[PDB]
Amino acid sequence: TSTVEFINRWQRIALLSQSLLELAQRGEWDLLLQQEVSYLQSIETVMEKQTPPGITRSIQDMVAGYIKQTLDNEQLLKGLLQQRLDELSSLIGQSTRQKSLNNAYGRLSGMLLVPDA
Amino acid sequence: TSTVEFINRWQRIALLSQSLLELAQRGEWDLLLQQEVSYLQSIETVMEKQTPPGITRSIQDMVAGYIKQTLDNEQLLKGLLQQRLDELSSLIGQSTRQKSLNNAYGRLSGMLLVP
Known part of the structure; x- marks a missing residue:
């Protein structure tokens, strides 16, 4: 459905954020610098997407948590x-x-x- | 020998310096931070140093060559x-x-x- 697709999209970003936190916690800046351009282009794409119709407060909360993460x-x-x-x-x-x-x-x-x- | 140590030091600085540069080109900054104090240490310990009696334009030119290096x-x-x-x-x-x-x-x- 469009609602899991919505959630998943944000699950995806939540991951990448945690990804770079590591590219730095460990020491890979040469890398991190490359993957940021994407992580940004990614956050950007998922924003010009169309939020599904049947969004429920439960779902709204789930996604928000990811964004918080x-x-x-x-x-x-x-x-x-x-x-x-x-x-x-x-x-x-x-x-x-x-x-x-x-x-x-x-x-x-x-x-x-x-x-x- | 008070003239040789004079050359040998700058040779050594020029060497350590080439070293540090190369490390940065590689991006091995963690080692740069380490060797830094020791480098600034030596390079300072050298200027604190006194210039010899018998410098010839050769020793002059030579050492200048390192300092500029x-x-x-x-x-x-x-x-x-x-x-x-x-x-x-x-x-x-x-x-x-x-x-x-x-x-x-x-x-x-x-x-x-x-x-």
Whole structure:
């Protein structure tokens, strides 16, 4: 029926959300980055679908729970992401030795008393 | 030997640096974080270092060659790492401010001047 199809569609997204939560909980960002484009294109498709006629409050609740499940992994993800963004952004900063080095290079580069033999 | 250790150190930095770059190209950032402190540690311990009495333009040129070598290795590393941050943010999404501010910046750079 169109009602199980409705439910199932959202069961499908609920899964993918939980899918990426892992692609990050474990460490696969190279992957996760690829599968997000889809997960998004997926949430999008299921939204321009036509909600069946005979929807009952019971069903409405079932689907909503899935969406909640989804929104909940979506917040865990965002957290882990901001966390990885954090420690990485931490690396660039400490190392503005570019000046220490550009200084260490420029200095040596401009010596005038340097003999040769 | 106080002249040799001088060269040998920068050789070593240039080496460690090539190392770290390569690791990033692979995306092995977990190891970068690890080796980082030790790297910044050494690279600093080297500038704290004193420059010898008998540098010849050869030792000069040579060492410069390394310093400029490690200097570009990092330049490249910074770019990969900045790109990770870039696509990583792309995912998390921008805050309300972040947008109102970024837009301002582009509107400025993407501005043609004429007085």
